[PDB]
């Protein structure tokens, strides 16, 4: 509704996007308290994923009476127990599920996605091709164009752009790589207000941001066993963190059903964003995400060498 | 259909958009031979429209056995017969249907749409408001921005832009009026090749162009009785003329499900276009079309005085 959209825009610059208390439904999330060893939150769709690891779970309510050792891999639990630095995700795979868990304050946060084993030399070949091509770039402009062409080759997204920020955080589209029959966004300007400060902040917590489907219903976090601290839990280090309905609408209005964005960092400063938009919904596996982030990180070093 | 898309792009500048031998499905079309008063062409969906005029019609095969006096209002036929000028459309309404027919070459062409009687002063109020506001404009910039705001208020479309052509027919977006959560298209350039010559030509035959749903399937014109001339019939004087699948795909990739464009003319030269895009499909009645075209016509006259 128009008035609800207006009210969202009223408080949008201050919206707490790190604590949506909901997730995107392409995975499930558990939140466990470190000291009480108890599940304190579960995403609404937790049943349809964790039934694969423990066949005794049928509804969301069964999780309260479920045992963590039945839901998570033994390796993931022991890795969370001995990991001492905060917000460093541990990635553990089984035959059917793909877990990503980290330690944040007094909690363990576990995301899980479905996973399909893919055995091929394709990633090693793509990695070598990407690096040699980026090493050959000797001019600033040639590098960003090669990077945008490579990101498109790897992910298959319909349009891939690079935003560069100016000192005052306004964005300009400095290079583009798009399929035919698309409006050219090259040299488009957008104001700093379009990306709130806290939205830029997330790229320093997790350098990739993933929206596989702008029209999937966000799943909220249900309380399971009562926590000692009831403040909402920061979800920013993982990938399932739900998207602001505002931005989902913005993406719809542009004809975009799926997006993936990657931060470009010069030292610790955020210099720009690599953004990928797709007209149809689109899922990218964890390995493809890694390949994109590694390619962008390699490109950044060469870029600073060139300037 | 990527490969087929590429082959269509190959021949796009040469594509004959005036003779698509198909129509958009928000109406039905008959093409009748002038001398024999015989239906030589009918759009495939004619049944669901003319069933309202003769309920003994259920499907297209009934039209082959039909006589036009059974399908059309008698005054419309006598008006087409007695008219002496070509391509000047006659507009005839019944309680349930709205016909637009004209005289073209060897035939009488008739479009028919569904129609619902709506009784209110809304149109007179909008008309008065538009004229008084457009009369207050004292500068070129004031006029284009007021016009874009007014066209948006009248049609309710999500985005309304004004393209201005330069001497070599490249387009620049000089003014825009768009809802919140939309990428600003202000000052966007597009090359002359993006609007082929035959498409600009159409605005001189009919100043409004209407696409109420980019995802509706074009309905082809079927031969009924063999005509004396087998050359394709120019459909450009009406509004049902089917849209190039190329442009429909272009609009999808831009997030547009419905579009309406209106030509801005300085004497008979085409000076620009007023374009309306909507994220979801949208239908505009014949009265709304007349109001949009008259408002643009009034704005243009004020513009030439202003410069
Ligand atoms: C007041 C708050 C607003 C807001 C919030 C918001 N935006 C993002 C992410 C965006 N939004 C971008 C906007 C654009 N402007 C343009 O001109 C174009 C052109 C293609 C775009 C895309 C933008 C560039 C980003 C970052 C990268 C991206 O392209 O996705 C977020 C983050 C969403 C999240 O939770 O991940 C928020 C909260 N957007 C506004 O426009 C104003 C209203
Ligand atoms: C080689 C032929 C091509 C083609 C054909 C084509 N275009 C139109 C109508 C258009 N197309 C427009 C394209 C744009 N360029 C931009 O930068 C933007 C930005 C928003 C747009 C929309 C355009 C402005 C018009 C006229 C206005 C409108 O919105 O309709 C047609 C006519 C369609 C019809 O009614 O039959 C045709 C045939 N489009 C191409 O992109 C190239 C491939
Ligand atoms: Cl990940
Ligand atoms: Cl009409």
What are the chain A neighbours of B6 within 8 Å (beta carbons)?
180
Q: Are strands A159-165 and A171-178 parallel, antiparallel or unpaired?
A: antiparallel
- Rounded CA-CA distance A159/B114 in Å is 40
Instruction: Using only the alpha carbons of chain A, give its radius of gyration.
Output: 20
Measured in whole angstroms, the distance separating CA B70 from the mean position of its chain's CA atoms is 27
| Binding site membership of B199 for ligand 2 (Cβ less than 6 Å) | yes
Structure tokens at A169: 């955080």
Looking at beta carbons, which residues of chain A come within 8 Å of B170?
none
The Cβ of residue B174 has, within 10 Å, a number of other Cβ atoms equal to 17
**Residue among A180, A194, A246 with most chain B CBs within 10 A, to mutate:** A180
Contact of A43 with A220, CB cutoff 8 Å: yes
Contacts of B16 (CB under 8 A, 6+ apart): B198, B232
Cα separation, B71 vs B46, in Å, equals: 10
- Which residues lie with the beta carbon below 6 Å from any ligand 1 atom? A 9, 12-13, 17, 185, 190, 193-196, 199, 209, 243-244, 246-247, 250, 259, 261, 273, 275; B 183
Between CA A88 and CA A94, with CA A91 as vertex, the angle to 5 degrees is 160
Of the candidates B256, B273, B282, B14, the residue with the CA atom closest to the CA atom of residue B165: B273
Give just the sign of the alpha carbon dihedral A298, A301, A305, A306.
positive
Give B-chain residues touching A246 at CB under 8 angstroms.
181
Residue of the nearest CA to atom 19 in ligand 2?
A: A183
CA distance A277 to A155: 10
- Determination technique used: X-ray
Q: How far apart are CA A49 and CA A71, in angstroms?
A: 10
Choosing from B175, B194, B218, B282 the residue with most ligand 2 atoms within 8 A of its CB, the one to mutate for a pocket test is B194
Level-2 CATH architecture, domain B1-28+119-307: 2-Layer Sandwich (3.30)
> Taking CA B106 as the corner, what is the angle to CA B102 and CA B107, rounded to the nearest 5 degrees?
35
Take atom 23 of ligand 2 and give the residue whose Cα is closest: B195
Of B6, B181, B250, the CB nearest to A253: B181
Ligand nearest to the CA of A179: 2
Structural contact between residues A171 and A195, judged by C-beta atoms closer than 8 angstroms: yes
Q: Which residues pair with B42 in a beta bridge?
A: B30, B222
Q: Cα–Cα distance between B99 and B113 in angstroms, integer?
A: 7
CA of A280 to the centre of ligand 1 (A): 19
Q: How far is the CA of B226 from the centre of ligand 3 (A)?
A: 64
Residue B230 to residues B20, B40, B106, B237, B278, Cα–Cα distance (Å) = 14, 10, 11, 20, 38
Chain A residues whose beta carbon lies within 8 Å of the beta carbon of residue B184: 190
Distances (CA, A) of A49 to A57, A268, B33, B233: 10, 36, 66, 59
Choose among A173, A42, A63: nearest CA to A111. Answer: A42
Instruction: State how beta strands B90-93 and A269-278 pair.
Output: unpaired
CB-based neighbours (< 5 A) of ligand 4, an ion: B 286
CB contacts of B5 in chain A (<8 Å) are 180-181
Q: How far is B187 from chain A (nearest CA, A)?
A: 9
B153: enclosing H helix or E strand: helix B140-155
Nearest to A47 by CA among A31, A34, A28: A28
- The whole-angstrom separation of Cα B284 and Cα B277 is 13
Nearest CA to ligand 1 atom 29: A275
The continuous run of DSSP H or E covering A40 comes out as strand A38-43
Confirm if A100 and A111 have CB atoms less than 8 A apart: yes
**How far is Cα B170 from Cα A125, in angstroms, rounded to an integer?**
43
Using a CB–CB cutoff of 8 Å, tell me whether B120 touches chain A.
no
The residue extents of the domains of chain A are 1-28+119-307, 29-118
Ligand 2 atom nearest the C-alpha of B259 is: 29
Which of B160, B247, B251 gets mutated to test ligand 2 (max ligand atoms within 8 A of its CB)?
B247
**Cα of A286 to ligand 3 centre, how many Å?**
5
Ligand 1 centre from A256 Cα, in Å?
Answer: 12
Q: How far is CA A68 from the centre of its chain?
A: 25
Q: After which residues is chain B broken (C to N over 2.5 A)?
A: none
DSSP state letters, B73-122: -HHHHHHHHH--SSS--EEEE-SSEEEEEEEETTEEEEEEEE------SH
DSSP state of A218: P
A160 C-alpha to center of ligand 1: Å? 15
- B253 vs A6: CB contact, 8 Å cut-off? no
């Amino acid at each position: 509704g128009s008035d609800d959209i207006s009210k969202l825009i009223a408080a949008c610059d201050q919206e707490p996007i790190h604590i949506p208390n909901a997730i995107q439904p392409f995975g499930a999330m558990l939140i466990v308290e470190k000291d009480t060893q108890q599940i304190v939150y579960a995403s609404a769709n937790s049943a349809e994923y964790f039934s694969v690891a423990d066949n005794t779970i049928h509804e969301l309510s069964d999780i309260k009476q479920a045992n963590i050792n039945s839901l998570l891999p033994e390796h993931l639990i022991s890795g969370l127990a001995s990991a001492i630095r905060e917000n460093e995700p541990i990635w553990v795979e089984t035959d059917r599920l793909s877990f990503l868990g980290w330690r944040h304050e007094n909690y363990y946060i576990i995301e899980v996605e479905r996973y399909h084993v893919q055995t091929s030399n394709w990633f090693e070949i793509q990695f070598q091709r990407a690096f040699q091509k980026l090493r050959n770039c000797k001019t600033h402009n040639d590098l960003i164009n090669t990077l945008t062409r490579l990101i498109q080759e790897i992910s298959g997204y319909d349009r891939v752009m690079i935003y560069q920020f100016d000192p005052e955080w306004n964005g300009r589209v400095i290079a583009e790589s798009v399929r035919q029959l698309f409006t050219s966004m090259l040299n488009h300007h957008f104001p700093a207000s379009d990306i709130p400060a806290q939205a830029r902040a997330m790229y320093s917590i997790n350098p990739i941001r993933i929206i596989p489907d702008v029209n999937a219903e966000p799943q909220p976090l249900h309380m399971i066993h009562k926590p000692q601290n009831t403040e909402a839990v920061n979800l920013s280090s993982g990938v399932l963190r739900a998207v602001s309905p505002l931005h989902m609408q913005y993406l719809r209005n542009f004809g975009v059903s799926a997006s993936t964005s990657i931060g470009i960092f010069n030292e610790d400063e955020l210099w720009g964003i690599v953004a990928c938009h797709h007209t149809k919904p689109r899922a990218i596996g964890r390995r493809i995400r890694r390949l994109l982030v590694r390619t962008v990180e390699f490109a950044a070093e060469r870029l600073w060498l060139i300037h």
